[PDB]
Amino acid sequence: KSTDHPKYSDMIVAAIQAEKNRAGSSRQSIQKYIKSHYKVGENADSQIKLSIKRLVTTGVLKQTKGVGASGSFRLAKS
C-alpha cells in the first residue's frame, strides 16, 4: 500500500491519456508531443522510455505494436 509519486511518469499519464480508445501513442510520437519547456533539452526521453516500461509493469499500460518504425502503448482501464 505504498503511494509512489514519480516525476517523468506523471508527465506520460497526461501524454498517454491525451488520446482515447484506438491504440495510437508511441515513444517517438509522445516525445515530440510532450517536449514543451520543462524537460532535459537532450536525451530526456531515454528516461521517458524507462518510465513507460515500468508503467506497463504496474499494470496501468498495455501494448499492441512497439519500437523501431512504429508503436502504440496506452492506459489499460483500472
Added chain:
DNA sequence: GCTTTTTTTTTTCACAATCCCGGTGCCGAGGCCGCTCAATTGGTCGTAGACAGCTCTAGCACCGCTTAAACGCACGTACGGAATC
C-alpha cells in the same frame, strides 16, 4: 448495453471487352548456289616500345601553433500537409 443511424461492406445480375483457339493464306526467313574479292600464306624490312639504369620530382610523413569552422544545444516561426469544399 440499446436502439436507431450512417457507413461499408458483400452479393447478385447484365454487359462490355479481352482472350484463346483453329482455320486460312501470303511472303520472307532461310538456305542453297555460283561467283568474287577480301582473308590467308609466307616473305622482307623497319622501328615501337620493352627493359635496364639513372636522375631528381613531388608525393608522403611528420610536427606545432592558430584560429575558423563544426558541433550541439535551446527555441519557436513559418512551413508542410491533412482536411474541406
